[model samples]
Target chain A: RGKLEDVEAEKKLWESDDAWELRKAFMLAHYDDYPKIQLQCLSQLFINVTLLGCEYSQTLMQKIRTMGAGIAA
Target chain B: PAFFRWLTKKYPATVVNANEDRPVDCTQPNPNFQEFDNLYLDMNGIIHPCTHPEDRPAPKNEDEMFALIFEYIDRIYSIVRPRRLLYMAIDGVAPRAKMNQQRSRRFRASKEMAEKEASIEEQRNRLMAEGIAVPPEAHFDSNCITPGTPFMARLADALRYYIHDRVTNDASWANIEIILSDANVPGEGEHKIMDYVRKQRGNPAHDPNTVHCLCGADADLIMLGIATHEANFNIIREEFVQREKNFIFLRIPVLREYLEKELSMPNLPFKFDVERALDDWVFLCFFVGNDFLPHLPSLEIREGAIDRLIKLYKEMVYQMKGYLTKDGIPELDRVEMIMKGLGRVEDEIFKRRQQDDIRLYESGWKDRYYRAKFDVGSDDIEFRHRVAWAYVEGLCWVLRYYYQGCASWDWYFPYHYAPFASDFETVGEFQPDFTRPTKPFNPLEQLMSVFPAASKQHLPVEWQKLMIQDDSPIIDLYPADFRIDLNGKKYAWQGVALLPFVDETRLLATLQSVYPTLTAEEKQRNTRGPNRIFIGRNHKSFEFFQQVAESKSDDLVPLDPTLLNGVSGKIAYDSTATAPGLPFVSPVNHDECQDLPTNCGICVLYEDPE
Candidate 1:
């Protein structure tokens, strides 16, 4: 973990949009019962992306509400 | 070492302390008794938890934190109320090798906290833009818990006061000695405690049967306890993973005798000392890791590295004259032989790891597992030897630290990844320059060295500004935008903080410009101090010391409690080197002590403990 090469390695891994790292952040943002601090971070990071306030705040409640609707169907 | 896992799995009996009730009434003992003379509190285990406990809510403030710590200390004392001594040690500045881990962790914490704080503000501000009810209490920022902050400085003071308060009031405390080695003292908590044992053992009057109970959760504490070669040494740690329900003791006597019999199996040409063999065992364990250097890839604890190493020791001890080491110093050829043995087995281990990597890629999240874990693939296999040789030096430093006190405070492993077992070729000549003494950093400067800019609130206003201000040159050390590389690890801690490791030359250059801006108070906080010893107000040694401390400076104090007219039951500072006053040792007489202050801590020259 202390290796400088790992930084170069990580930069390459996160070099794209569809990277697992970015997707994981929002996946946790939507469903993961992480923490207010963490979800708050992901929501702000994606603030420039989506206009639905926080996925943890607005998008989160709606996502859960829609999740139940789909299950009922 | 994460060595605890292997230890429990291999030695099931050692894990017996879990699921047992400890005596609440320390004076009245029940059946499950293994009484100890001394209880060493590796204070960070208590400090970090009390400061900002994980399960329960954190303290309202630093003062409340100390209260939590006092109650925690009281609880530990009840579990293992030591008869002769209670040593409470806080993490002081350590050698540069250890600081790499601290720096990496703190930088990540600071970076994380800064982003979280800023983003939380951003969220609150969003509601404010609409004028909706908003904002919440600030998250408790414990970036101050790292070594060189005002919080740490106050912690030392609070501990000193607590020690005094305990001695004065607590009935169990007044009779026996209580040493408070505050954060101002330089060394890791466990190692500093070992230094006392090592020095005490060297003294002619040391008790051979002194039962030591070290209380620390760090897996390395087991190794340190075993390294001392004491018959009656044990460690008390809380049960539960990253959380504790009750404390349990792991007795080391079993392991000590077991190791001796195992090492003694292969007869040798030269006479063997079981004590010397224990020292070698410590050296051999370093092949795995020394905190600074990562363990050799093949020597993964779960992979039976200890078993492999012991098997090699048995095979080689007959050919070699005696034990592999005499008091932590490895015989070059003996170590080389083991390195070669590890080298011989390399292909299979590496092959297995590669096969495991193949399986890892089957997972959708996995892009690369073996690459980041081992600097393998394109890196010439020859490069692993460079890593291997660096690791051997870490072995020697662990040696020197155990035998002779700290050789170089500034030296640490530059590489993150350890060498593969086979990479032991051509690494025989290089060794750390153990000749010169190393220096430690001042509190504020150490904060600068280890803490990320995001943790600026812990520092004095001016220093904090220097960390956050756009004009600051070394702000590069504390990048607001640093990535966390999970690196195929599920747990966050196992992940790497991919922040740029500080360029020491550049860091010092940038800091020099800001030195003059420091105020008198800031400069004082920036300086280090001597570790003080506290005793009860009523003890005869206390009265004697009161007279001695009133008049001081440049005099050799001679205090022998054994021969002293009548101070048998009384407790005092272990330092009795000088004639009329305690010669408070600074622990850093060398120039490289951050290019500032003294480096001599040879106190405790008293004869015979009662």
Candidate 2:
């Protein structure tokens, strides 16, 4: 019963997960594994998570960066 | 005995003196047959009755029976049809004529009275000046007081009574009914009514409970009756007395009971059944239309009331669907009903948009429509009216949402999802984020898209930039200049000779001596006349001479011209030459031969030659 429950829990976790690690693999394949690029990936992931919590957080974050966050924000 | 009885009954001497002509014509169909017939029928018709009597009346014919019938016919014709029309037309015409005559008489009388009063006052003044003891009431004309004309005075009294009655009994009820029915007639006419009402109440604070109609009757009950009739006429009888009594009871607890019962019934799902309650809500909204809504007391409660009303309308439709199919409410009919319901509200919205576009265009905020737009205050009557229309539309959207479930994209975007999904911080960004933008993503653009081009000119670019963001230092640099000093204080050139000197030469020798190196042509020109220098005579000549000499650097310069013929006589020839031919030494050659030249040479030699 413990093994079966563990398998069910794992399946649920996989189903809910956004597969962000797969994006990292794609990035690495497209561009060399640069440290700044990896940091950008991490920052984007944080924004995506926050966006899922609300309606327009992800788009708002991108807009702020594009329009100059220090001045416009 | 038979002759005496006949004399006593019919042929008495009293009958002989009766005026028979006065009573005979009253039975005629057209009492004003000659005058009114010309107006209504053909003008050329003879002035005749259907039948004419053969002879004049005698003593027995002038008896009471014939007279009574004539009188009755006259009264009926005058009161019922033709006579009444004549009286009305005459009544209308007579007042204006009488008013003019009375006015002229009053003016003349007032003038005469004023003159007399002035003379009396002057006499009183003289008496007072002399310190004579005069009684306060002792004045000329005190013994003969001229009262106003009886007819005019009575008419004025009647008019005053009517005005007073209207103020005291009818104004409040009319105002309340107008507001409740949303039949507000706008413009100068409405303002005049409001101004009059305000004056009649002595500018008292508007209180619904104490308001009276212009006729001095309780207005609240009348307003309640009007509201009941507008909302649901089925509940009460149309007769005046019954309606009045019913309104008196229905405005209080009876109304609350009706409302509660209507609300509780699953089949009957209307929010307000009592006319007075509906009127109260409508009047309350109108009273606060000028006040800011956010600052108003109990806003949430008011919103809740509106929500309840909307919910009631929804439930009514839901239940009505059971009896009527979806197609039962015809498209054209529903459109017409909605349009009628939103009559002023739709017009107000259009007007507000037009005004807004004009303001923004004048302020150069047309381009800023994508970023920020002018907000209409929620408290404004125009704005509130518009919101009321939007609320109705929102109710329809709710219905659509329910019907279509997930497929109602338009409804969700405008009414629900957009309002819920807006991001406050990023709402007016220059570039909107595409992926995460709200359902109604470009609100500013959407609202302004249908607006017409503004008529007013835009402000300058600098002003527009100043309006959008507040961090620029440009405004601080250009402080306003209010002082009138420091204008038109720059240097300008003045090129005329400063002072002039005149020299007279009697002969060519003296002119040659004065200008030692003159050409032959210059010598002849100098010798031609009694040459005199008038400096600053012509602008071009002065400028040329001044420029050649470089004399502008100094403050002043001298100009000399020789004169030949002096005003007193010819240039003085040497005194000895006039006596005879004393070597013919002319005055012009005199200076050359004089020792003054040697003296000038010596003076120049003594001075430094810088």
Candidate 3:
């Protein structure tokens, strides 16, 4: 488990305005013809939204984490 | 679903699982331990499932679809065994407000369905190339479910035949009168049922102790049930999340009981009326959402918006010295007081909402929201005022709609988004008028407004041309594609479809030119009609019906309470109604269902008692 301050700092970076822009841009650009990646991102995004009790914050985090997992796979 | 979820959580005892008996052969004693006097089936719920099932394959053809519908209705009927009346209402031409949502839904459906078809085709082509045989595709266009379409017309006929057959053959259907309010009727399915209930209740002969059970898929059905204030009322809806065939009963009496305790006021200056308070509560729930209006931004069901409203209401009711709503009309001053309370914290609500979403803007949440959704800025406070006024009107319209009937057939909220609750300070100044003396759209007119170009096949050739031809004046109405703004939602289906709202004057004017080109059959389909009632040959009222039919008069005879078992209505002979002893043939393909050898049921047109 991470420290409270460490988690807060990480969340602060993830939920920044810059992160919002990046996630929206990535989704709008690639959502149409990339169901394989779309499914991966959306599935995790849903989990994050429900877990975090919010809608707009975790898109960037979800996208980055999903892509990282995809590359590893 | 959100509001219903909140309601069930707050008042858990309101919902109970229905004990249903399987393999319903004929109507039997209800297993749910309640003998309901009337059962209302909002037929679209049954129709949608039967036409395109989730658990099972889609019906092979139209005949199979009708058979599936019959069986589904049979399942409900056997479960309830409503001894007095069974009212089956298929969705008719909805109010203009409902059309916008329908347009958005149908357009998205066509787009989504096209995507699915494309993917399936791609899969099939690959398999075929790999030396695998792929079966042919048969797509049933769901857009045909619209009121004016040929499918709806056939469905009405099929239901008519079904009613005749059931009453004639089924022993349980012998005594009870059956009303088939089909798509040609000019109101929503549930609203039509509510109208019937209201009108019947107003009559002196109506039984005050009647146990009413309404069955539908819509969450609003619960609200409608509560709005009736009937002593015994319940809504039976299929369990949404479960894979198993199950139903849950939402008892309105229990809900009223919960509300009674929840809304108890202390040290009141005036007498407290629970019924009036219940009406006000229904009005508050509208802030969360309704079919005809977009929910206010400051009040999401998940965010304890309803609870917040109730707290505000309880605190402010003393100051206001009255309820927010009386009967169907809203006391605008009291509503304004509630809004003032809500408005005080709306900034906090919006800021918190943004913070939760990680949009860390300190201020201008209202500005940003207006800019994003309504494409207006702070300079457009007039627009905000208009939206707020319209929202108030919608509140009044919905309450009136629930309690009385269609206050106005053509009345609808004219905006896509709702004004913030904070904008309602001046709502008291505006008293909305619904008495514009407007008639509902002709069936085909509604199809033209709601259907996309992809669904042009459902319309007549002349009408179909308008949807496709670039030269047509109203071509823009039927967009092949449109923007779906996710509007802070994850799924595309959960987005706001920014389709152009139909300009009624323009649509009616453009359609006028093509009216002459319509076939006789198309013309008939476009017209509205009255609900038809069926009685078995053994029914005590059959002699009266037979006499009326033979006389061939247009005069309506008042229904006798003794024969009807306390249901009040007037019956008139329908010249077009199928006569008794006629050979009733099934319109749809029915493997198990045989054509009635001799139709022993008499049919007549029915009008609600004044």
User: A-chain TM-score per prediction?
Assistant: 0.25, 0.25, 0.31
Tens-place lDDT per residue, model 1, B26-55, is: 555522466667889998888888876777
Better of 2 and 3 by DockQ: 3
TM-score to native of every candidate shown:
0.75, 0.15, 0.86
What order do you get sorting by lDDT, best first?
3, 1, 2
Q: Residues B41-98, candidate 2: write the lDDT tens digits.
A: 1000100110112233321221222233223323322211221111100011111111
Model 3 ranges with Cα > 4 A deviation: A1-73, B23-28, B122-137, B351-361
lDDT of 3 at B315: 90
Question: Candidate 2, which segments miss by more than 4 Å at Cα?
Answer: A1-63, A66-73, B1-371, B374-394, B400-411, B414-610
Highest DockQ scorer: 1
Cα lDDT tens digits, model 1, A21-71, are: 443444343544534333332333342123112112344345334432322
Question: Model 3, range B189-279, lDDT digits (tens) per residue?
Answer: 9999999988888888888899999998777887788787789998888886887989888899999989899888998767889888888
* Residue B142 alpha-carbon offset, candidate 3, angstroms: 1.2
Cα lDDT, model 3, residue B22 = 49
